[PDB]
Design a protein around this ligand. Structure first.
Ligand SMILES: [Mg+2]
Ligand SMILES: [Zn+2]
Lengths: 134, 102, 129, 220, 221, 82, 71, 25
RNA sequence: AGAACGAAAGUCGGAGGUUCGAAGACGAUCAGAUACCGUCGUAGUUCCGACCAUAAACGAUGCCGACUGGCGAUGCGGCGGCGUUAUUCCCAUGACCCGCCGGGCAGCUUCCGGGAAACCAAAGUCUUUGGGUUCCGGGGGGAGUAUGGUUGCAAAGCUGAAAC
RNA sequence: UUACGGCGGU
């Protein structure tokens, strides 16, 4: 019987998207803010909206919830834009190939242009996981 | 309407198969329409395993299994609910249900 | 058991032109179907085709251009007179602007328009447009 | 008052696309009905075909919707066909015109022979199938008229075509399908390669790349 | 590219081979017999890189031939490819769609999620097929960087590289982002482009911040 | 379409596919017309002009558009010459 | 499949004359038993004397007595 | 009535009249 | 035209006769049970010989021929290859493994196209209609009935109407 | 385990 309707959840998401700078994990403070900052027609859904806000307060302090509020949206610039690492994951100059694909780059005329040590491949040819239920 | 592509039966390049008999009702079905079920039920009924091994004359006795093959007419396969009616698009698969033993 | 060899070849051309293919392979070659194909190559439907000489009946590889709509065959080689030809035209041609019922005469395998520029009614052999 | 949302309707209200016959030849998906109302305004008469009361079985009684069939078109080579379910006739018959002009095709006109002047019939004999009905529109000689059933003659005279022999197989008393079958035959007169269309087409510049100015400079 | 300027530039082989990009997986579609070199003894098809270089140039020749740069829509559904698809839009000035692609984007003209692009480029044909079959309705030519697994139904300039590992996808976004700016007046073919290919790769799991601050006790402190 | 008067009596001349040579219809909404922009020889940048190819939707749905667009770039001086 | 070759016109014409006996309106017009059986004997009108008025009852949806004779 | 048992009650009936014609020759 | 073969039941004669089991007897259950359920049980089911020629005898799709997408698998031959396992401590053939080709029972995919649709890689290549050829259909019933003929020991089979 | 029916036209 606790489960909250669509209009309580929808209108509380537009607060935390928009007034996250003013809210905290206290019920009785946010109950006063949502009174001042939204137009709530009656008192029961005032503090029923404000309860879902504080439920969203502990929820967004852990991780990326459906939370397009600015601070959670800005910090992912420190992940996808930053970490251009000072070392390369492409440049090691000791990389392995196989004796069939050392034929491949020789007709590409890059056989003596590269270092490119080879590894001899297994002759087992076991590829193709067993058919049938057991 | 033809309901199924094969006619409920796995015969293709034949004309006649052996007829077998249902287990509970003893009805004559062909061998390749009948709903088969191979049962490897333990004969000891696992609630009574720690009641016979302490009466056993051994200290580690590997209990025999019971090896029963069932094969049903489909008239009794649905009534005993070993198979269930399926929807017209979830029906076109022959894959068996997952096991879920422990 | 190939009762008609023009019928099989020209069925084979028709399936690949609607399939989008640039070449076909026609397994028996004949002197009726190399004179058949140089009536539509001359009117401009197919391009360069090669006869593959073998010691049994040869093969034909045709370069399809894309300008072909249908290249059927009238399978009983009916006889058509020049009186009777005008009611063959309006049955199995899409229009009077284009398309040819190609028919074998005593003077050679011709068009329908070549058949009446000469006076050479013959046996109907196929049609193409 | 009509503001558009797509490029093709945005580039028409500023009168930069001229004479529709290029947005056919680039095969644009027309989305709003006001583009076809813009070019061919004051040349469209819009007369209905049948209004049939389809209905479904429900828990108590029967939902009755209405199925209005209207075909639109000038006398110069454009036809439409509009079909729409709605709860009431007057709004089914209204929105079907919106569906009829939005699905509009050019019909190609040809000659029976002796190409003396304006084209008057179908260029070749053409077919359309929809369900079980096939309608075969056959090139007629000059001075024939439309030799057909009443309802495909409603679309042929609305195609600006002078004369056409016609045959039809099937349940021709299935007016919804017997109108879509005749619509499909005159929808493929430009989809049929005749020997006047052999030479390799020079490709002109499409209005989405020729009018990148008005989306970059004026829209943005 | 039939030139000498647009040739293979042997350095890239040191990046292609260090990031996969030539390993088809298990089986090959029948429309990719021509992009392949041979099957290994591992069962893996390995890919003629000359064929995947001639396609990677060909795709940017259409994208350069799109006049407005923020008009090609670049899309990616699987996560291995969601970081690279954003940055590419940020590189060439395109418009990205990452995550879920809501159907009705290209054809339902009512709602405000209505993109109307002239060309589209895909991370994976078989996993991100919903924009492809919707591009069939609004006459839109599509590129899709594809593996031997994938079908090629509505695609046109299918890049036969790889779409499976994390490093191969981000590099092929990088090699394509590089080469579309290099057909314009931004990179002069001589100086190598300073944006690192490790920038576009799929992001690690959650020990990201922990490893870097475990190795930053002499630059912050 | 050149009547005996010698006049063009036609609404438009429709495009035709460069692969299958068949006519794109008026509402074949899968037919693409896309451009392939060539470069100059000596420096490899976009010189201004391009080349157009129309691929009809019937041959596009069949799934060898890439076999098509490569084959007409092979014949028209772009891809590889080997 | 059917016959088509420039020699089968005996087979096709013999196949048509015996399959026309399978629609009714050829069969009642060319077999002869249908006109040796109708009361008119192949005419349009007939005089006859009235034996008995009889009132037959209409079909189930309706309900009335249709007035008839026994000529 | 089943089509195989419409068949039985006429095969039973056309042997009953095959005897009545046979009785009254 | 004319032939051979044809499930099951059925018929005649001879061996057999465990099981099952039409008919039948009884028990039950039921308002009634000439049914389902139970006990018993004849004909029969088994073999031999002679008959009968029909089945939802079905893939409800005639046979032969060609062309037209893909993929994995199977079965029988054939060819070609890393390796592993067999007296083999070396062989040649086996057994597995990776392909290819041919014929086969199928399967999954596919806007090839078809279709009234269910669905079919054929039921595709059909109003853009013609690859050969045989049988057969023409609203529902009456009716696979009547009658003539013919086949059978019989049961019946083939042929097969009309009035209405 | 037993459970059978529901006049005609709208
Ligand atoms: Mg019965
Ligand atoms: Zn049972």
């Amino acid at each position: 019987g606790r489960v909250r309707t669509k209009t309580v959840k929808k209108a509380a998401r537009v607060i935390i998207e928009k007034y996250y700078t003013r809210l905290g994990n206290d019920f009785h403070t946010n109950k006063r803010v949502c009174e001042e900052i939204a137009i709530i027609p009656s008192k029961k859904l005032r503090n029923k909206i404000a309860g879902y806000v504080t439920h969203l307060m502990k929820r967004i302090q852990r991780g990326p919830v459906r939370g397009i509020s600015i601070k959670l949206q800005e910090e992912e610039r420190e992940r996808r834009d930053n970490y251009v690492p000072e070392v390369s994951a492409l440049d090691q100059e000791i990389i392995e190939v196989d004796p069939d694909t050392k034929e491949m780059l020789k007709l590409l005329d890059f056989g003596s242009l590269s270092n490119l040590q080879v590894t001899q491949p297994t002759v087992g040819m076991n590829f193709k996981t067993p058919r049938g239920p057991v | 309407t033809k309901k199924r592509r094969n006619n409920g039966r796995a015969k293709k390049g034949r004309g006649h198969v052996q007829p077998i008999r249902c287990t509970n009702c003893a009805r004559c079905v062909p061998k390749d329409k009948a709903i088969k079920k191979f049962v490897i039920r333990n004969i000891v009924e696992a609630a009574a395993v720690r009641d016979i091994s302490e009466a056993s004359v051994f200290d580690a006795y590997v209990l025999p299994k019971l090896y029963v093959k069932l094969h049903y007419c489909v008239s009794c396969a649905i009534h005993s609910k070993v198979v269930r009616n399926r929807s017209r698009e979830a029906r076109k698969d022959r894959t068996p249900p997952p096991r879920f033993r422990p | 058991v190939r009762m008609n060899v023009l019928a099989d070849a020209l069925k084979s051309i028709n399936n690949a032109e609607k399939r989008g293919k640039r070449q076909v392979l026609i397994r028996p070659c004949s002197k009726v179907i190399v004179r058949f194909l140089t009536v539509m190559m001359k009117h401009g439907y197919i391009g360069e085709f090669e006869i593959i000489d073998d010691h049994r009946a040869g093969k034909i590889v045709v370069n399809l251009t894309g300008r072909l709509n249908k290249c059927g065959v009238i399978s009983p080689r009916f006889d058509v007179q020049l009186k009777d030809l005008e009611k063959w035209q309006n049955n199995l041609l899409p229009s009077r602007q284009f398309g040819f019922i190609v028919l074998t005469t005593s003077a050679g395998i011709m068009d329908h328009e070549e058949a009446r520029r000469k006076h050479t009614g013959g046996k109907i052999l196929g049609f193409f447009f | 008052e009509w503001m558009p949302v797509t490029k093709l309707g945005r580039l028409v209200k500023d009168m930069k696309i001229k004479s529709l016959e290029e947005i056919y030849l680039f095969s644009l998906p027309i989305k709003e009905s006001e583009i076809i109302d813009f070019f061919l305004g004051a040349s469209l008469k819009d007369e209905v075909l049948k209004i049939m009361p389809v209905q479904k079985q429900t828990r108590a009684g029967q939902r009755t919707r209405f199925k209005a069939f209207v075909a639109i078109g000038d006398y110069n080579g454009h036809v439409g066909l509009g079909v729409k379910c709605s709860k009431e006739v007057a709004t089914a018959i209204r929105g079907a015109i919106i569906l009829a002009k939005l699905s509009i095709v050019p019909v190609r006109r040809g000659y029976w022979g002796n190409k003396i002047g304006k084209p008057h019939t179908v260029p070749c004999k053409v077919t359309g199938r929809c369900g079980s009905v096939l309608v075969r529109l056959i090139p007629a000689p000059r001075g024939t008229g439309i030799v057909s059933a009443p309802v495909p003659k409603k679309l042929l005279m609305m195609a600006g075509i002078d004369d056409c022999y016609t045959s039809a197989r099937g349940c021709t008393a299935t007016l919804g399908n017997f109108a879509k079958a005749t619509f499909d035959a005159i929808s493929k007169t430009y989809s049929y390669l005749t020997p006047d269309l052999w030479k390799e087409t020079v490709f002109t510049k499409s209005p989405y790349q020729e009018f990148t100015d008005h989306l970059v400079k004026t829209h943005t | 590219g039939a030139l000498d300027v647009l040739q293979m530039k042997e350095e890239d082989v040191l990046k292609f081979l260090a990031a996969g990009t030539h390993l088809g997986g298990t089986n090959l579609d029948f429309q990719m017999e021509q992009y392949i070199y041979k099957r290994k003894s591992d069962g893996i098809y390995i890919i003629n890189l000359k064929r995947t270089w001639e396609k990677l140039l060909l795709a940017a020749r259409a994208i350069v031939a799109i006049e407005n740069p923020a008009d090609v829509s670049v899309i990616s559904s699987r996560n291995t490819g969601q970081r690279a698809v954003l940055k590419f839009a940020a590189a060439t000035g395109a418009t990205p769609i990452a995550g879920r692609f809501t159907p009705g984007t290209f054809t339902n003209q009512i709602q405000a999620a209505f993109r109307e692009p002239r060309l589209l480029v895909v991370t994976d044909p078989r996993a991100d097929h919903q924009p492809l079959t919707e591009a069939s309705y609004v006459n839109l030519p599509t590129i899709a960087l594809c593996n031997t697994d994938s079908p090629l139904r509505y695609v046109d300039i299918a890049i036969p590289c790889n779409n499976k590992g994390a490093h191969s996808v981000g590099l092929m976004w990088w090699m394509l982002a590089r080469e579309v700016l290099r057909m314009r007046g931004t990179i002069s073919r001589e100086h190598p482009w300073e944006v690192m290919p490790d920038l576009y790769f799929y992001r690690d799991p959650e020990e990201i911040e922990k490893e870097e601050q475990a190795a930053a006790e002499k630059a912050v402190t | 379409m050149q009547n005996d008067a010698g006049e063009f009596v036609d609404l438009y001349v429709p495009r035709k596919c460069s692969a299958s040579n068949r006519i794109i219809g008026a509402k074949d909404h899968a037919s693409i017309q896309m451009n392939v922009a060539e470069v100059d020889k000596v420096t490899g940048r976009f010189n201004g002009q391009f080349k157009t190819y129309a691929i009809c939707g019937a041959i596009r749905r069949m799934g060898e558009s890439d076999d098509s667009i490569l084959r007409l770039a092979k014949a028209d001086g772009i891809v590889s010459k080997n | 499949g059917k016959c088509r070759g420039l020699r089968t016109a005996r087979k096709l014409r013999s196949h048509r004359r015996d399959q026309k006996w399978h629609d009714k309106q050829y069969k009642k017009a060319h077999l002869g038993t249908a006109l040796k059986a109708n009361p008119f004997g192949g005419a349009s009108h007939a005089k006859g004397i009235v034996l008995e008025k009889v009132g037959v009852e209409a079909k189930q949806p309706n309900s009335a007595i249709r007035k008839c004779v026994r000529v | 009535m089943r089509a195989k048992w419409r068949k039985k009650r006429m095969r039973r009936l056309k042997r009953k009249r095959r005897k009545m014609r046979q009785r009254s020759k």
